[PDB]
Ligand binder design. Structure first.
Ligand SMILES: Nc1ncnc2c1ncn2[C@@H]1O[C@H](COP(=O)(O)OP(=O)(O)OP(=O)(O)O)[C@@H](O)[C@H]1O
Lengths: 310, 138
C-alpha cells in the first residue's frame, strides 16, 4: 500500500516547503528593506509556491478517508487512481520546488534610479504664478539654459523643490532629473557634485579616479541622455565642462536650470535670455502664509473676521 | 494525457524565461550606463528570446481549447499532432535558452575609443574663413 506512505511523504514535503518558503520570504523582506526589488526568479518561485494549493488535495484525501472504511469495496476504489496520480504530481512538484528553493543565493537587485527623486514638499503659498512661468520657459523656451535670480530666501530653493516634485505628475521625454546644490562652497567643491551626478546615473563611483578624467567620463555619459539638471544658488562663474556637465545646445533636448542671488553670474552662464526675476509674495499670499506659522490660541485670536479688533 | 502537462510546463517555462530576460536586460542596461556596448553573445540571446513568440502557440492552443469541447470527437484530433510537436519544440527551446541565460557572467565590453572625441561646441561667429584656411594647410 504505497498511497499512505506517499501521502505521508507529501505531508513532510509540505512542512519542509513551508519552512523553505518562510526562510526565502524572510531573506526577500530583508532585501526589500534595503530599497532593493525582489529577484524575478525568486518572485516566480514564490508565485509557484503560493499557487501549489496543497490544501485542496488535503481536503480531497480527507473526503476519501471518510469512505476509506473498506479497502475491498470498489464503490470508492475508482477515485483511488485520481488520488494516486494527484498526490504523486504534488509530491514531485514539491520536491522540484524544494531543490530549486534551497539553491538561490541572491534574493534582490538594485533597481534603476527613478526618473525623478522625491524632494521635500514643504507647504507653499502663492507660488502658482511663478511656477507656471517656470513651466512656460521650460517647455516653450528656445534656450536650453534657464536662469532664475532674486533676493536671498524668496523661495528659489523652494521653487526648485516644488518644480522637481511636480515633474513626476507630467509626462516628458527627460530620462534623468538631477538636483545639485552648488552653494555648499564658493570654491566649487567638485567632488560632491560628481558623486551626486554619478549616483543619479547608476554609475560606479571611484575614489582614486582623477577629477579631469571623471569630468570627461561624465561629459560623455550625459551626452546620450536628455537631462534636466537643477543648479541651486550658484554664486561664481564656473565652467560646466570642468565639473562634467556638458553645455546643452539647441541640437539637444536637455535643459539646464540654475538659480542665483546675482544677475551677473546668471549672465555669465549664457542664460541671459531665460531669465526670470523672483518677485516677492503678495499681500494675500503673505497673510495666508503668516497664519500657517501661528498657533490657533493665537490664530483664533486673530483669524476671525466680521468683528474688528486691534 | 501528456499535452496538458506539457503545456503547463511551457507556461512555467514562459514565466521563468520572462524573469530571466528581465534580469539579463537589467544587467545589460547597467552595463550600457557605464558607456559599455552590450555583449554580442548576450545580444544574440536577447534576439532569440524576443523571436521566440510564445504568444502564437498560446493563441493556437486557445483556439484548440475552443474545440477541446469533446475529447471523443476526432475531426479536430488531427491538429493535436501539430500542437504536440510545436509545444515540445517551444518547451525544449525555452529550456535551452534558460540554461544559457543563467550562465552569462559578463554582460558588456568597453568599446574601442572613437575616431574623434566630442568637444565643447560653443557658438562661433565669423570663424569660417580661418577654419577654411586651417583645412587648406591641413
Ligand atoms: N511659497 C513659499 N511658501 C512657504 N514657504 C516658503 C515659500 N517660499 C519660500 N519658503 C521658505 O523659504 C525658506 C528658505 O528657502 P528659500 O527657497 O526661500 O531660499 P533661497 O531663495 O534659495 O535662498 P538663498 O538665496 O539663501 O539660497 C524655506 O524654509 C521655505 O520654507
Amino acid at each position: 500500500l504505497h498511497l499512505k506512505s506517499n501521502w505521508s511523504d507529501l505531508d513532510k514535503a509540505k512542512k519542509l516547503l513551508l519552512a523553505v518558503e518562510t526562510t526565502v520570504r524572510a531573506r526577500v523582506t530583508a532585501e526589500v528593506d534595503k530599497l532593493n526589488i525582489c529577484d524575478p526568479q525568486v518572485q516566480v518561485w514564490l508565485r509557484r509556491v503560493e499557487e501549489l494549493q496543497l490544501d485542496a488535495i488535503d481536503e480531497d484525501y480527507s473526503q476519501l478517508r471518510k469512505y476509506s472504511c473498506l479497502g475491498q469495496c470498489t464503490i470508492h476504489a475508482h477515485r483511488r487512481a485520481s488520488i494516486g496520480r494527484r498526490v504523486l504530481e504534488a509530491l514531485d512538484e514539491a520536491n522540484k520546488l524544494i531543490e530549486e528553493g534551497r539553491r538561490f543565493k541572491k534574493f534582490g537587485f538594485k533597481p534603476l534610479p527613478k526618473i525623478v527623486d522625491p524632494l521635500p514638499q514643504i507647504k507653499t503659498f502663492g507660488l502658482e504664478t511663478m511656477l507656471s512661468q517656470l513651466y512656460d520657459l521650460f517647455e516653450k523656451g528656445d534656450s536650453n539654459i534657464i536662469g532664475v535670480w532674486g533676493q536671498g530666501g524668496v523661495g528659489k530653493t523652494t521653487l526648485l523643490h516644488v518644480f522637481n516634485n511636480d515633474l513626476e505628475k507630467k509626462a516628458h521625454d527627460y530620462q534623468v532629473v538631477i538636483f545639485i546644490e552648488v552653494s555648499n562652497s564658493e570654491a566649487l567643491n567638485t567632488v560632491e557634485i560628481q558623486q551626486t551626478i554619478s549616483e543619479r546615473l547608476n554609475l560606479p563611483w571611484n575614489d582614486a579616479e582623477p577629477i579631469a578624467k571623471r569630468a570627461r567620463f561624465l561629459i560623455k555619459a550625459l551626452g546620450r541622455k536628455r537631462f534636466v539638471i537643477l543648479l541651486d544658488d550658484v554664486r561664481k562663474k564656473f565652467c560646466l565642462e570642468d565639473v562634467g556637465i556638458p553645455t546643452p545646445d539647441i541640437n539637444s533636448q536637455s535643459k539646464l536650470i540654475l538659480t542665483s542671488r546675482y544677475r551677473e553670474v546668471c549672465f555669465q552662464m549664457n542664460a541671459q535670455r531665460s531669465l526670470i526675476e523672483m518677485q516677492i509674495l503678495g499681500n494675500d499670499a503673505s497673510w495666508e502664509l503668516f497664519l500657517s506659522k501661528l498657533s490657533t490660541e493665537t490664530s483664533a485670536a486673530v483669524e476671525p473676521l466680521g468683528s474688528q479688533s486691534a
